Coordinates of C-alpha atoms and ligand atoms in Angstrom, one line a residue:
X179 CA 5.5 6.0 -25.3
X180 CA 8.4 3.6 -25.7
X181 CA 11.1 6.1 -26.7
X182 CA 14.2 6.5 -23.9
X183 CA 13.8 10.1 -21.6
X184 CA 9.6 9.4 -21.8
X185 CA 7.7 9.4 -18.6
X186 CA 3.7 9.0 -19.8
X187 CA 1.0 8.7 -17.4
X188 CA -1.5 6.2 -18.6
X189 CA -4.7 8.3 -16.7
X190 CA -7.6 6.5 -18.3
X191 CA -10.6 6.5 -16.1
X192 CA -10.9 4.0 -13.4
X193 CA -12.2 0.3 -15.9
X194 CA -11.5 2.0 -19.2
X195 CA -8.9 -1.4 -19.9
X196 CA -5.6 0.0 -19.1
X197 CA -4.1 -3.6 -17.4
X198 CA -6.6 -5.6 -19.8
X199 CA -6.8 -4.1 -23.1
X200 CA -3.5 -1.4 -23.0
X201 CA -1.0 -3.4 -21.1
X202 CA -1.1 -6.2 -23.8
X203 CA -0.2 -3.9 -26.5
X204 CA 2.3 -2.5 -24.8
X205 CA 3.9 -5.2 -23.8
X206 CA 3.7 -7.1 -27.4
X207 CA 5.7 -3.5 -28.5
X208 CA 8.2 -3.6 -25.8
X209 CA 9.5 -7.5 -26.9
X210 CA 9.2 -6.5 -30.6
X211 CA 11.5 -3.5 -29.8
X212 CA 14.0 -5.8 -27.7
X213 CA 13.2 -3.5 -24.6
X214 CA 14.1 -5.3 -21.4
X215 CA 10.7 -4.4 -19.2
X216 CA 9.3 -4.7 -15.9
X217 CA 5.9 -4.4 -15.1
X218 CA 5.0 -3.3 -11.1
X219 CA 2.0 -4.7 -9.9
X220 CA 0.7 -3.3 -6.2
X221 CA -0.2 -6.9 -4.6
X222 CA -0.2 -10.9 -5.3
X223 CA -4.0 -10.3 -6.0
X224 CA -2.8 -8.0 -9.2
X225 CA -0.1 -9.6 -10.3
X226 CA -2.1 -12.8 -10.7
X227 CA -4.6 -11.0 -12.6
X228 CA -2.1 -9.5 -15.3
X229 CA -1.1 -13.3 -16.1
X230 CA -4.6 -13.4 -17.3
X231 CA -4.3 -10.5 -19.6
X232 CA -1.3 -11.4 -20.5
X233 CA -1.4 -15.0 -21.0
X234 CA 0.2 -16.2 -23.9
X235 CA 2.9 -13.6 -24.2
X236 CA 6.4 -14.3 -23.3
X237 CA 6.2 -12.8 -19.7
X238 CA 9.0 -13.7 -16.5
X239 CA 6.4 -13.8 -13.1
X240 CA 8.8 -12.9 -10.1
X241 CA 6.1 -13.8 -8.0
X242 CA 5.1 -17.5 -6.7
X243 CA 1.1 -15.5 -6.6
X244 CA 1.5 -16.7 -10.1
X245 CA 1.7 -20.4 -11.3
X246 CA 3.7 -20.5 -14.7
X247 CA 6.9 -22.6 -16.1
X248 CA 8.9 -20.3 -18.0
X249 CA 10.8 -20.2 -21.2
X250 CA 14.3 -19.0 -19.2
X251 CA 14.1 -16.9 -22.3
X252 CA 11.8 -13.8 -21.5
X253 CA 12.9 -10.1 -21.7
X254 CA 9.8 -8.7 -20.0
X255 CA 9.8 -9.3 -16.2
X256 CA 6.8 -8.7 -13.7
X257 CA 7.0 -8.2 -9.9
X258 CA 5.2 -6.3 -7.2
X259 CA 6.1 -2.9 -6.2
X260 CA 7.2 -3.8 -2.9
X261 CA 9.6 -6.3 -4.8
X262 CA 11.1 -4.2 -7.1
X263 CA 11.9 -1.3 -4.0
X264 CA 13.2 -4.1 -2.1
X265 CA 15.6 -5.7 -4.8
X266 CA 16.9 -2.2 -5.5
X267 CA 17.7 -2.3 -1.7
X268 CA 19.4 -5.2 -1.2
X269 CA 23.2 -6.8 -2.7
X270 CA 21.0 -8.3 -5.6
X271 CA 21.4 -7.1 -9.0
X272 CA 18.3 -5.8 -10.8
X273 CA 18.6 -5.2 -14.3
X274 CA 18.5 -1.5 -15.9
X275 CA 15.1 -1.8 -17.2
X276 CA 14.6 0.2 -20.8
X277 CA 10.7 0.5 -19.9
X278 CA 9.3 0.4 -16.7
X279 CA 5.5 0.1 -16.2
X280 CA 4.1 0.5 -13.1
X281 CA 0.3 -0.4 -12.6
X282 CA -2.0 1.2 -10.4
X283 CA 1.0 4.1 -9.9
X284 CA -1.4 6.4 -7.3
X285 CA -0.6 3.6 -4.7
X286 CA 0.8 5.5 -1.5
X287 CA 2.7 3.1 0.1
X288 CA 6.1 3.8 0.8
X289 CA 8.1 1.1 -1.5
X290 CA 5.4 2.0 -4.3
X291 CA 6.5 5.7 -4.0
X292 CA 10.1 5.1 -3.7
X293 CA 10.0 3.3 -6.9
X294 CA 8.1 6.1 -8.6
X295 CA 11.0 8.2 -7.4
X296 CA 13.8 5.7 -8.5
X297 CA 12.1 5.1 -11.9
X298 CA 11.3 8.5 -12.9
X299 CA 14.9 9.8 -11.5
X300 CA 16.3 6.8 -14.2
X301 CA 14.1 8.5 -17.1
X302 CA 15.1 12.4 -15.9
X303 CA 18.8 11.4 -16.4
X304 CA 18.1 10.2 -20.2
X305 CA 18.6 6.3 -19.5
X306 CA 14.8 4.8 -19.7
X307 CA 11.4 4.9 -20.5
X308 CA 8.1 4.4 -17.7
X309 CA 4.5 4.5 -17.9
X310 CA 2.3 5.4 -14.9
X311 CA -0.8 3.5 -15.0
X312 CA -3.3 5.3 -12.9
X313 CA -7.0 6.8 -13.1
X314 CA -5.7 9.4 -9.8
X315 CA -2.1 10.5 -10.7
X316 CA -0.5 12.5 -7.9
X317 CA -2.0 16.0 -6.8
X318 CA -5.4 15.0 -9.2
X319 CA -8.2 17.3 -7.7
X320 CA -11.0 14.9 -9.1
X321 CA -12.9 12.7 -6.9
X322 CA -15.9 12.0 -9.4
X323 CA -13.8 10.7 -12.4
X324 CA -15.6 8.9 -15.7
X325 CA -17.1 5.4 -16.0
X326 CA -18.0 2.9 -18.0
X327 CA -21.5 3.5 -16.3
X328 CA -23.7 6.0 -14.8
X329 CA -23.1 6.7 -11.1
X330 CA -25.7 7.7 -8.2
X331 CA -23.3 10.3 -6.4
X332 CA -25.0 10.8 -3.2
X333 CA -23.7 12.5 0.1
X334 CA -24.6 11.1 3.3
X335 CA -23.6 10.6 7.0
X336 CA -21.8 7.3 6.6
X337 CA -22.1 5.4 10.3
X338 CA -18.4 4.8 11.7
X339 CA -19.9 2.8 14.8
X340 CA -22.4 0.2 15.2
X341 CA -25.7 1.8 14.9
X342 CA -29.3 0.6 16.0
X343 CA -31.3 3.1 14.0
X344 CA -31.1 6.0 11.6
X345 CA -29.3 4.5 8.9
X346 CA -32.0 2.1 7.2
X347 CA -30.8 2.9 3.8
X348 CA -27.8 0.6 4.6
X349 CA -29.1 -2.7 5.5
X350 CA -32.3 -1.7 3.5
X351 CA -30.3 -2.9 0.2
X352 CA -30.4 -6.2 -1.6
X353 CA -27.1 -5.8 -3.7
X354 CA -23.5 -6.1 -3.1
X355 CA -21.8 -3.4 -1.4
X356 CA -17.8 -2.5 -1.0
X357 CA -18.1 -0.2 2.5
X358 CA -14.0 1.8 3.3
X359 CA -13.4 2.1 6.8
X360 CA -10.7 4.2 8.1
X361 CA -9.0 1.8 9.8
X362 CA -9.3 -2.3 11.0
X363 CA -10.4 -1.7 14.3
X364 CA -13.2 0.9 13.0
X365 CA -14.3 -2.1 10.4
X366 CA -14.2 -4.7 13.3
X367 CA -17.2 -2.9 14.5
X368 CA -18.8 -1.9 11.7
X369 CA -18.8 -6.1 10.3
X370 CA -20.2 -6.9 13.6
X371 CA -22.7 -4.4 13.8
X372 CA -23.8 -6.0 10.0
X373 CA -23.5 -9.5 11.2
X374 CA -26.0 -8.7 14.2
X375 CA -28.3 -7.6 11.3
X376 CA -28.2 -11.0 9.1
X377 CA -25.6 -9.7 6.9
X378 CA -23.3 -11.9 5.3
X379 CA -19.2 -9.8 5.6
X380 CA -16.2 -10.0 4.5
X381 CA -13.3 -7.7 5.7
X382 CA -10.3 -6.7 3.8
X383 CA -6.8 -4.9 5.0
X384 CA -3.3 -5.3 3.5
X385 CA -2.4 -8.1 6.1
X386 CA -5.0 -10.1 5.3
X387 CA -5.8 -9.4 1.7
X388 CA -4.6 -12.1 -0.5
X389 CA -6.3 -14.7 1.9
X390 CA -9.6 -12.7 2.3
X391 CA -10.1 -11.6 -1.6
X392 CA -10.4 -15.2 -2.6
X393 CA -13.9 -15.1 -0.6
X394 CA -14.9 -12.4 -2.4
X395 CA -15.3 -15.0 -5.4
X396 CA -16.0 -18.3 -3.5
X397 CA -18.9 -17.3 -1.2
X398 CA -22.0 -15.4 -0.9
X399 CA -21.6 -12.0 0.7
X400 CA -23.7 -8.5 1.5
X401 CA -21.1 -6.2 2.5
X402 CA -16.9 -6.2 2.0
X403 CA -15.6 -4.1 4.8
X404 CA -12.4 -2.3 3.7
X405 CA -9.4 -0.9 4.5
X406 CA -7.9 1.9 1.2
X407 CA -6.3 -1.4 0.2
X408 CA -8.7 -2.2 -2.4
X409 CA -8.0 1.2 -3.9
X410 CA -5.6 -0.8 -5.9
X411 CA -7.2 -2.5 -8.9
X412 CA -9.3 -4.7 -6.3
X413 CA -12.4 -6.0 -8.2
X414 CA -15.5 -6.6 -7.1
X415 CA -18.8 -7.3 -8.6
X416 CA -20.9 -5.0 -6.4
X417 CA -23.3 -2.1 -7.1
X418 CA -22.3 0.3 -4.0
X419 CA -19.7 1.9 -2.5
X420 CA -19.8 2.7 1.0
X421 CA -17.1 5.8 1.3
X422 CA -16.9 7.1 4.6
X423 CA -14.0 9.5 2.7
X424 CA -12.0 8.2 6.0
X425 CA -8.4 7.5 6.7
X426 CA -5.6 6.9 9.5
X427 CA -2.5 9.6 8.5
X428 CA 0.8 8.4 10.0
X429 CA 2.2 11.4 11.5
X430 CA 5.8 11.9 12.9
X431 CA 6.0 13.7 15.8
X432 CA 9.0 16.1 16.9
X433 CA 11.0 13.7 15.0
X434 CA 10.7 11.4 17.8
X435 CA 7.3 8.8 17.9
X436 CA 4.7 8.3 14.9
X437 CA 1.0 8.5 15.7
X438 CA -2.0 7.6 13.3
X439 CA -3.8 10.7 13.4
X440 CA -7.2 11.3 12.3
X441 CA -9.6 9.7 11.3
X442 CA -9.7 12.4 8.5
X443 CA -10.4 13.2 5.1
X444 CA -9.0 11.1 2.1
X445 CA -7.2 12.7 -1.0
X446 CA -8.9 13.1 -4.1
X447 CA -7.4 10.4 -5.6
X448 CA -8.7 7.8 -2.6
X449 CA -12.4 9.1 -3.1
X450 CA -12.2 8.4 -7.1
X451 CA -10.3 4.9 -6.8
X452 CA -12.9 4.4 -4.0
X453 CA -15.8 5.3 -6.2
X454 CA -14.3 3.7 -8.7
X455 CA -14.8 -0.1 -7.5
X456 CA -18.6 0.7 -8.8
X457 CA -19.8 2.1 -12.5
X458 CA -17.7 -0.6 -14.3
X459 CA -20.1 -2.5 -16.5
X460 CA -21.6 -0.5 -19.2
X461 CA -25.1 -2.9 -19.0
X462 CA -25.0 -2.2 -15.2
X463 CA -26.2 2.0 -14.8
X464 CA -27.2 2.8 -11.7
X465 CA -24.4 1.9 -8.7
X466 CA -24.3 4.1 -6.1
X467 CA -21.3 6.1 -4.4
X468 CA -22.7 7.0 -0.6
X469 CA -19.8 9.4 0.6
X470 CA -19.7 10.4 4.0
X471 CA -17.3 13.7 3.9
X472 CA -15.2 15.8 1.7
X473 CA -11.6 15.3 0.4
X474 CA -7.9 16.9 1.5
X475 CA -5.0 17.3 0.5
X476 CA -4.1 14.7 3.8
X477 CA -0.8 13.0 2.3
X478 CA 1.0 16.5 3.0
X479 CA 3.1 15.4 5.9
X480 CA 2.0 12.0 5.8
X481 CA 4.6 9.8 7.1
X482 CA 5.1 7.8 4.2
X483 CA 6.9 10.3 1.8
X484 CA 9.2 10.5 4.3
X485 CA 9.7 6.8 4.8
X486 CA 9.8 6.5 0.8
X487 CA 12.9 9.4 1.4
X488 CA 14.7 6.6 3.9
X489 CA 14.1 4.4 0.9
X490 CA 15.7 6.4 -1.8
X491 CA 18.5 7.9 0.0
X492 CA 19.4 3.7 0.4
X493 CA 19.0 2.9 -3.4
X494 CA 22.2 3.2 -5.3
X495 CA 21.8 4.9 -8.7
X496 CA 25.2 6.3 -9.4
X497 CA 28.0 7.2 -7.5
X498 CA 27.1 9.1 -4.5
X499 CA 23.9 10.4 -6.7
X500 CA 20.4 9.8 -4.4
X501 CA 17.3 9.6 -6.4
X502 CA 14.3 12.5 -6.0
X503 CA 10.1 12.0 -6.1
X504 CA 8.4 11.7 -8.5
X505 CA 8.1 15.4 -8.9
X506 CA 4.0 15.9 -8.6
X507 CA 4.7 14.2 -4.9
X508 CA 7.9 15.6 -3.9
X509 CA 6.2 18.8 -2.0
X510 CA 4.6 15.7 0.2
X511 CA 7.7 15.7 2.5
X512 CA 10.1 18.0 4.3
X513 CA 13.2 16.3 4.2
X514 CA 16.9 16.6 3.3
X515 CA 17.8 14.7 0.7
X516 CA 20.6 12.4 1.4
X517 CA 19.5 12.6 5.6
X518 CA 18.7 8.8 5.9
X519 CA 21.8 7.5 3.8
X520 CA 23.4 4.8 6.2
X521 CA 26.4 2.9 5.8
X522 CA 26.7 -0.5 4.0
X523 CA 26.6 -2.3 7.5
X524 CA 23.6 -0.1 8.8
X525 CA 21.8 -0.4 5.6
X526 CA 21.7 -4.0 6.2
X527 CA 20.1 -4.1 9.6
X528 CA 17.6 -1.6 8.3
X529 CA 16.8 -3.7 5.3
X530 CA 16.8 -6.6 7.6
X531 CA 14.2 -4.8 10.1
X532 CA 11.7 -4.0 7.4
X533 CA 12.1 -7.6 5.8
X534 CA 12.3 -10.3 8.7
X535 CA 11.3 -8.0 11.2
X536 CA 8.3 -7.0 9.6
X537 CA 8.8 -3.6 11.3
X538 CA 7.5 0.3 9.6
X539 CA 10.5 1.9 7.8
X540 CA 10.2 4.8 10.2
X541 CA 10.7 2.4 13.3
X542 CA 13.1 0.4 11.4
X543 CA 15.4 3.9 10.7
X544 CA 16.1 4.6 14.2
X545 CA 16.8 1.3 15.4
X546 CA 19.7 0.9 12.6
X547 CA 21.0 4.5 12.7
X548 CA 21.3 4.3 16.3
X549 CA 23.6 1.3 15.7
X550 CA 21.8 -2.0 17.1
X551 CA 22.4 -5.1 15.6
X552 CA 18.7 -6.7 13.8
X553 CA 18.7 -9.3 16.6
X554 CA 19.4 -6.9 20.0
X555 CA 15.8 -6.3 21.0
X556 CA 16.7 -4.4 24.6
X557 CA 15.2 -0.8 22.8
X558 CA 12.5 -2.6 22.4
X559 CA 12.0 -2.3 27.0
X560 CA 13.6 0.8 27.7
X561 CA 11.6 3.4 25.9
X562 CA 10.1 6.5 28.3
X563 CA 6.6 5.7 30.9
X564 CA 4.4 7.7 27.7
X565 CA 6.1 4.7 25.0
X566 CA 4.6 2.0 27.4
X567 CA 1.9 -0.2 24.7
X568 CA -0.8 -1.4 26.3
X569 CA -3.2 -4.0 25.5
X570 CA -6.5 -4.4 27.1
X571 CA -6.6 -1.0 29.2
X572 CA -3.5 -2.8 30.8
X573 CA 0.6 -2.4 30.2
X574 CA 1.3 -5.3 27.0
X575 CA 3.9 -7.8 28.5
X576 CA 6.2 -10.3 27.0
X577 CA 8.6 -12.5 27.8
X578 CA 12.3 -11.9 26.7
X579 CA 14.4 -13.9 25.2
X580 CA 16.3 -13.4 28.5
X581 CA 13.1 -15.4 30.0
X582 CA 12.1 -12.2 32.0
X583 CA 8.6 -10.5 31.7
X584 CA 9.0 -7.3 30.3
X585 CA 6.5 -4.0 30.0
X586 CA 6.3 -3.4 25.9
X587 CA 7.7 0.4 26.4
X588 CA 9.9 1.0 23.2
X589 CA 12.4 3.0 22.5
X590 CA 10.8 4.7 19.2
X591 CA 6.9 4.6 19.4
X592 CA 5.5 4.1 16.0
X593 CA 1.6 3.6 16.6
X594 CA 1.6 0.8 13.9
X595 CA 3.3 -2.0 15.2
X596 CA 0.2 -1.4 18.0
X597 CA -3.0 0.1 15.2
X598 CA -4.9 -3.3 15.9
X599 CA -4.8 -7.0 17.2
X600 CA -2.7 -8.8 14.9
X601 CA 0.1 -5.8 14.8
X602 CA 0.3 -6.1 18.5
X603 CA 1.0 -9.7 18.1
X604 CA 3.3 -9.6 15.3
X605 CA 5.4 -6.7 17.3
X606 CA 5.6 -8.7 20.9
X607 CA 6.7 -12.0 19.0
X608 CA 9.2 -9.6 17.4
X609 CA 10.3 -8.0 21.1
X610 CA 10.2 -11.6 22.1
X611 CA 12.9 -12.5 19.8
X612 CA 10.8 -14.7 17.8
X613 CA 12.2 -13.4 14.2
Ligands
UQM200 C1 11.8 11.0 11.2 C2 13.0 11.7 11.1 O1 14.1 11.3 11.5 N1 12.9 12.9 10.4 C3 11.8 13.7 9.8 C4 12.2 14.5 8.7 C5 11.2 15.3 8.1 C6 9.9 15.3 8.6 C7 8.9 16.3 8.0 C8 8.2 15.7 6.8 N2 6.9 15.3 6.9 O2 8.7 15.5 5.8 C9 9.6 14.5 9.7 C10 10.5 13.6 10.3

């Protein structure tokens, strides 16, 4: 795998020991060989977990999720994915890595793709090595992959609302069950509707999922309600899933506003990293996979190859050279490359939006191609009437920084910074001038 101009996807089934049993060994090869590495894991949660595995071997965590003292002296490096997209970004120097492993490579976020695009752009030219670790690589048309153990593959009408009858089979179980919701808001109701019933919940999204994991370990629970976050490498010890086969697709519209269309139908590769949470001890035959609708093909137009293409065409990689996809993702998105490249002062503010202001790559785009500085929140009021947020069946208000109150009607309408509670929040302390 190790040799230079090698791109090898890893594609083990979901538990067969690619982080625990493969990673090791490839890593022990790699500093034998003298080959400066990275290793991308998709969260904190992750990360911390490959210390385990790794433990012992001489390994740089660029993470504080992990809680070493290091040699100074190690040529193997690990980070998140978001990290790694991030550094490339900024004025900080990452090194050329000779190997570049990225863990849990199916993740669909937009960093995690742009760094399958930088990486295997870096290989294509002749100057590195990567390995894809993933049980669902891109365009995989298998939702019912191999385990360790037997599966009950069932297909049922999933609720997606609190229910006060004709789902029995749900509460009528005495195990552990991982149930994925389409979005936060849909789980909201879903926990509550459990919690009526006695049921003890726990509910995971990518905002809250370092924090919320943890409980997973440290308390009794029923039922983990679940954003597709935990389609990366989360672990639970549970005997069903729960697949609604549900997700929010972020769509943009006539160039102009992004909407989170759907509920719809998950990819392949979400139904099998879904299933796959269950099935993983060899002693325990006999989980269950409830799924509650077919697959798609719903990344095509999915606004996050396209925000992973405002990524790329702001990574150097030589001269005025702009990295492509990964090619089995490339067909994902309809863009130009090259379209979002900004200049150095432009770049910033955009890098500066997603960072400190939290803000979707989409929405951060168009604030720092039209020219506004990171702090000058006025687009943020004088969007069109049909931009106008609301919050409680009412128009969301802030005050300025100006001290005046202020309608939430932005300029750009991304339905994101809006999908649920905490976004709203985070997005009026942001048109507040709070960060
Ligand atoms: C947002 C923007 O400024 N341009 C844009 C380019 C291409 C597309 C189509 C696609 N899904 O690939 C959508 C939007």
């Amino acid at each position: 795998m190790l040799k230079k101009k090698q791109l090898t996807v890893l594609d083990l089934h979901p538990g067969a020991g690619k982080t625990r049993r493969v990673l090791p060994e490839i890593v022990r090869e790699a500093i034998k060989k003298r080959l400066r590495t990275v290793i991308l894991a998709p969260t904190r949660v992750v990360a911390a977990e490959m210390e385990e595995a790794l433990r012992g071997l001489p390994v740089r965590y660029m993470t504080t999720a992990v809680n070493v003292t290091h040699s100074g002296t190690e040529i193997v490096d690990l980070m998140c994915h978001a990290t790694f997209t991030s550094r490339l970004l900024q004025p900080i120097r990452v090194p050329n890595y000779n190997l570049n492993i990225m863990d849990e490579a199916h993740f669909t976020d937009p960093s995690s793709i742009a760094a399958r695009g930088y990486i295997s752009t870096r290989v294509e030219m002749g100057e590195a090595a990567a390995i894809f670790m993933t049980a669902t690589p891109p365009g995989t048309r298998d939702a019912f992959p191999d385990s360790n153990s037997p599966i009950m593959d069932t297909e049922v009408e999933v609720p997606e609302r609190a229910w006060s009858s004709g789902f029995d089979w749900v509460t009528d179980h005495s195990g552990k069950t991982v149930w994925f919701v389409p979005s936060v808001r849909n789980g909201n109701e879903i926990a509550a509707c459990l919690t009526k019933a006695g049921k003890r919940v726990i509910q995971l999204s990518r905002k809250t999922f370092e924090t919320e994991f943890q409980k997973t370990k440290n308390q009794e629970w029923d039922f983990v309600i679940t954003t597709d976050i935990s389609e990366m490498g989360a672990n639970f010890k549970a005997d069903r899933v729960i697949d609604s086969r549900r997700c929010l697709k972020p769509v943009i519209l006539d160039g102009e506003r992004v909407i989170l269309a759907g509920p719809m139908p998950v990819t392949h590769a979400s139904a099998a990293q879904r299933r796959g949470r269950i099935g993983r001890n060899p002693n325990k035959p006999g989980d269950e996979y409830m799924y509650g609708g077919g697959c798609a093909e719903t990344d095509e137009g999915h606004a996050h190859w396209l925000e992973a293409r405002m990524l790329l065409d702001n990574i150097y990689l030589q001269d005025g050279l702009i990295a492509s996809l990964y090619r089995p993702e490339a067909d994902k998105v309809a863009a130009i490359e090259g379209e979002f490249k900004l200049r150095t002062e432009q770049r910033k503010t955009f890098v500066e939006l997603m960072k400190r202001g939290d803000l979707p790559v989409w929405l951060a785009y168009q604030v720092a191609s039209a020219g506004i500085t990171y702090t000058d929140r006025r687009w943020c009021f004088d969007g069109t009437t049909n931009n106008t947020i609301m919050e409680d069946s009412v128009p969301a208000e802030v005050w300025t920084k100006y001290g005046e109150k202020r309608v939430l009607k932005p300029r750009w309408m991304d339905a994101r910074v809006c999908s649920d509670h905490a976004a709203l929040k985070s997005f009026k302390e942001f048109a507040a001038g709070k960060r």
